[PDB]
C-alpha cells in the first residue's frame, strides 16, 4: 500500500492515567485510502489532531480499530482504552467524533458529520477540544460547520468510500496500537 505511515505495534492496552487522549482510526485509515473525501491527507489530519492534543499538555495515543468501520464504534473502542475516557474516532473519509466513556455509542461530546467541510484548522481544534475534555474543561465547542449542498455533492461518494472501508473490518480483532511515522 502506497503512502504508509502507521505500524501496528501490538494490542492496545487500557491507559491508567488521566493524562492522555486516544485517536482511534478506522480499519482503512492510511491504508486503502490516504486522503479524506476532499483530498486532505490522512498524514496531515493525524499530524494536526496530535498537535492539538499535545499543545494542550495531554498525551496523544493512536490506535487502529477493526471490529466495525462505523466511526462511533471505532471511537467507543478508543474511549474504553483511553486513560482519560476521552477518544477521537476518525474514518478514512474524514468523519470525526469526540467520544466519552459512559456515553451511549451513538451519542458523543462533539460530532463532525460533514467531512467535506473539515479543514486542517478544524482537525487541530478537534484535538485541542478533546484534550480540554480530558482536563475536565468545558471547552467552547468547535463551531458548527453545515452546508446544505454537502450531501448533494458528496453523499454518493461517501457511501462508495465507506463500502470500501468496510472491507477492512475483522470480526473479533482487538485494537492495535500504532507507531506513527510523523
Amino acid at each position: 500500500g502506497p503512502g504508509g505511515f502507521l505500524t501496528e505495534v501490538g494490542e492496545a492496552r487500557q491507559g491508567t492515567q488521566q493524562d492522555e487522549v486516544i485517536i482511534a482510526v478506522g480499519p482503512a485509515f492510511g491504508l486503502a485510502q490516504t486522503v479524506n473525501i476532499v483530498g486532505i491527507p490522512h498524514k496531515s489530519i493525524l499530524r494536526e489532531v496530535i498537535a492539538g492534543i499535545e499543545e494542550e499538555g495531554i498525551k496523544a495515543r493512536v490506535i487502529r480499530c477493526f471490529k466495525s468501520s462505523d466511526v462511533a464504534f471505532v471511537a467507543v473502542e478508543g474511549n474504553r482504552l483511553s486513560g482519560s475516557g476521552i477518544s477521537i474516532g476518525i474514518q478514512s473519509k474524514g468523519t470525526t467524533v469526540i467520544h466519552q466513556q459512559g456515553l451511549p455509542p451513538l451519542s458523543n461530546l462533539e460530532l463532525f458529520p460533514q467531512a467535506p467541510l473539515l479543514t486542517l484548522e478544524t482537525y487541530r481544534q478537534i484535538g485541542k477540544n478533546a484534550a480540554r475534555y480530558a482536563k475536565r474543561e468545558s471547552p467552547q465547542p468547535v463551531p458548527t460547520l453545515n452546508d446544505q449542498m454537502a450531501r448533494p455533492k458528496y453523499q454518493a461518494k461517501s457511501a462508495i468510500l465507506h463500502i470500501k472501508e468496510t472491507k477492512y473490518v475483522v470480526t473479533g480483532k482487538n485494537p492495535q496500537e500504532l507507531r506513527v511515522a510523523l
Binding site: P113, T144, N146, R151, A159, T166
Partner: protein, 551 residues
C-alpha cells in the same frame, strides 16, 4: 474548440449533483435488481418456513422478525396466488376500496409487494397513494433548528411554523448536550403558534427516550430501522431492541413512528447485493411487525443514494406507497437535500405533494437551509411563497397557508417572551430583551446575538441529571404571566394520558381534538369523492400575497 452551448450547460447547478452508474454487486441500484429474491412463502404448523426463497434456517434477525410478526398469514395464500399485475391495477383503480386492499397487501411478502409496485409508473403510484393514505386529511411536518442550537431562535421559528400550518415539528442538535434546551424551546414555541402541534427532538435512541420520559417532547420519529443485519447492528439495534423501544414509548403514552428509507444500507456499507427498494420493503415490514403505527420513509437522510441512480425518485415514491399499502401512517420525507437544481427538487416533491400523504413532507425546513441541522431540506423557509403559489395553481392542499408578516412578528415575539419567562422561572441562563427582539425579526442564526454556549449546555444537562420535568415549564410559564401558554402546554401533557393520539396517523387539531386514521378514515372512491380542497380551506389557500384586484 468548445461548444458555448455545452459550456453553458456545464455550469448548470444540476451538474454539481452526484450521479453514479448502477453497481448491482453493492446494491447501488434503486429497484428491480437481478439479485432481488422472487416472492415465496411456505407455512407449516402456522409458522413461516420459507420467506422469498430463503429457508428459515438462513433467516437473519430481520427475516425472523418479519416472518413471525410482520405478515398477515390469514390471507397469505390468497394474495400470493394473485397476479402481481392485477394487484398493481387494484392499487390505482379508483373503484377498489382501500378497505378491500389492506387485508391483502398486509398478507404479502416483502418481495411480493415490491414486485407489485414495480409494475407501476409514478402517475399510477400517485393515483394509488391518494387512496391508500391512511388519514383522509393530509398534513405536514417541519424542521426547526439552527447551527448555534440557539433556544430563543428555535422558539420563534417554531411559533412561525405552527402558524403557517405544520402539525408536527422536529428539532435536533449541533451539540448533543444542548438537547433539553432545543426540545423545551421547540415545545413552547409550537404551542404558542398553534396549541396541539406535536414536537420531537431527534437524538441517539436512549437519550431521546429519556428526554421524552421527562416530558419535553410529545412524540418521537427518528426511531431507526435498517434493511440488512450488519447495518442494523452498526445502527446499534436489533429488530427486538427497536420493538421493545416502540412499546416503551407507548408505555409512557408517547406517540412514535419508526424511520427508514432507501439507500441507508448502501450508505452504511452492507447492501448484501440487493436493490434499495427491496431492502426498504424489509424495513417497512419490520415497522409493521413491531406494531408501530407509522413510518417516516422515502429515502429521508440517504436521498443522495437513490437519486444518484436511475429510477431512484420513482423508487422513493414506491416505498412511500408500500408503506401506506401496509396500513401504516406515512411521513413521506421531502425533508432532505439531494440536488443543486430547483427544477429537480420540485419534481421529487410533487410525487407526494400531488396525491397527499399523512405528512407530505416529514421535515420541510422552517428555517433557511444554512440553519438546517439535518444538513438541509428539500424545501426551506425561502420556498414558503412558492409552496403556497403551487397550492393555489394546482388546487392541491399541501398543508400550509399564506400568512401576514404582522401576525408572524407578533407570534414570534410571544414565543420569545414565553421562553424568556421559562428560563427566568427555571433559573436558566437569561434570555435578554435584545435576544427577544432579535428572534422576533430574525431570518436565521446570522441575525441572533451569540449566547454563552458553555453555560447553556451546563444547565441543559442539569435538566437531565436532576430530572427536571415538563411541569416545571408549565409552572414557569404560569408564574411568568403566560397562563394561556401554560394551559396549552398542560393540555399537550394530558394527551399522553388517554392513548388516543397513539393511533395511526394521529395529530391534534382545533381545540385539543385528536384526528387520526381511526376517526378520519380515508374513503377515496374516485373523482368528487374523498378529501377535496374546498370551502374555507380553499379560500385560505387562494389568498396569497400579491394577488391584486384587477378593476
Amino acid at each position: 474548440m468548445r461548444s458555448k452551448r455545452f459550456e453553458a450547460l456545464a455550469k448548470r447547478p444540476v451538474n454539481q449533483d452526484g450521479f453514479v452508474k448502477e453497481w448491482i454487486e453493492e446494491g447501488f441500484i434503486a429497484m428491480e435488481s437481478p439479485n432481488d429474491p422472487k416472492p415465496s412463502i411456505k407455512i407449516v404448523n402456522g409458522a413461516v418456513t420459507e420467506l422469498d426463497g430463503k429457508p428459515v434456517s438462513d433467516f437473519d434477525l430481520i427475516d425472523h422478525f418479519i416472518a413471525r410478526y410482520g405478515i398477515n398469514l390469514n390471507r397469505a395464500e390468497e394474495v400470493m396466488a394473485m397476479d402481481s399485475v392485477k394487484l398493481a391495477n387494484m392499487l390505482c383503480d379508483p373503484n377498489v376500496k382501500r378497505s378491500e386492499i389492506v387485508p391483502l397487501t398486509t398478507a404479502m411478502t416483502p418481495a411480493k409487494i415490491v414486485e407489485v409496485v414495480s409494475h407501476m409508473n409514478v402517475v399510477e403510484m400517485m393515483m394509488a397513494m391518494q387512496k391508500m393514505r391512511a388519514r383522509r386529511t393530509p398534513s405536514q411536518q417541519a424542521h426547526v433548528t439552527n447551527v448555534k442550537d440557539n433556544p430563543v431562535q428555535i422558539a420563534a421559528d417554531a411559533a412561525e411554523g405552527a402558524w403557517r400550518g405544520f402539525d408536527e415539528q422536529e428539532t435536533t442538535v449541533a451539540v448533543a448536550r444542548y438537547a433539553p434546551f432545543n426540545a423545551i424551546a421547540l415545545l413552547v414555541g409550537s404551542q404558542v403558534g398553534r396549541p396541539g402541534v406535536l414536537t420531537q427532538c431527534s437524538l441517539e435512541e436512549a437519550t431521546e427516550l429519556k428526554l421524552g420520559m421527562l416530558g419535553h417532547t410529545c412524540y418521537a420519529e427518528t426511531i431507526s430501522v435498517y434493511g440488512t443485519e450488519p447495518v442494523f447492528t452498526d445502527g446499534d439495534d436489533t429488530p427486538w431492541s427497536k420493538g421493545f423501544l416502540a412499546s416503551s414509548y407507548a408505555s409512557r403514552g408517547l406517540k412514535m413512528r419508526f424511520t427508514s428509507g432507501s439507500g441507508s444500507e448502501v450508505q452504511m456499507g452492507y447492501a448484501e447485493g440487493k436493490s434499495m427498494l427491496y431492502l426498504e420493503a424489509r424495513c417497512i415490514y419490520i415497522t409493521k411487525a413491531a406494531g408501530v403505527q407509522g413510518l417516516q420513509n422515502g429515502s429521508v437522510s440517504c436521498i443522495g443514494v437513490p437519486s444518484a441512480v436511475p429510477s431512484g425518485i420513482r423508487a422513493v415514491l414506491a416505498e412511500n406507497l408500500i408503506c401506506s399499502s401496509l396500513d401504516l401512517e406515512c411521513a413521506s420525507s421531502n425533508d432532505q437535500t439531494f440536488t443543486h437544481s430547483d427544477m429537480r427538487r420540485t419534481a421529487r416533491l410533487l410525487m407526494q405533494f400531488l396525491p397527499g400523504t399523512d405528512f407530505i413532507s416529514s421535515g420541510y425546513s422552517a428555517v433557511p437551509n444554512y440553519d438546517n441541522m439535518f444538513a438541509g431540506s428539500n424545501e426551506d423557509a425561502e420556498d414558503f411563497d412558492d409552496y403556497n403559489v403551487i397550492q393555489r395553481d394546482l388546487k392541491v392542499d399541501g398543508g400550509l397557508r399564506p400568512v401576514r408578516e404582522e401576525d408572524v412578528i407578533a407570534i414570534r415575539n410571544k414565543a420569545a417572551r414565553a421562553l424568556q419567562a421559562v428560563f427566568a422561572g427555571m433559573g436558566l441562563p437569561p434570555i435578554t430583551d435584545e435576544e427577544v427582539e432579535a428572534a422576533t425579526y430574525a431570518h436565521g442564526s446570522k441575525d441572533m446575538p451569540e449566547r454563552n454556549i458553555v453555560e447553556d449546555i451546563k444547565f441543559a444537562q442539569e435538566i437531565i441529571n436532576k430530572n427536571r420535568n415538563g411541569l416545571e415549564v408549565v409552572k414557569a410559564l404560569a408564574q411568568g404571566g403566560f397562563t394561556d401558554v401554560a394551559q396549552d402546554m398542560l393540555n399537550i401533557q394530558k394527551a399522553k394520558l388517554t392513548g388516543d393520539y397513539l393511533h395511526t396517523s394521529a395529530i391534534i387539531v382545533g381545540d385539543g381534538q385528536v384526528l387520526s386514521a381511526v376517526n378520519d378514515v380515508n374513503d377515496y372512491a374516485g373523482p368528487a369523492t374523498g378529501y377535496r380542497l374546498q370551502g374555507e380551506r380553499w379560500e385560505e389557500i387562494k389568498n396569497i400575497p400579491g394577488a391584486l384586484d384587477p378593476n
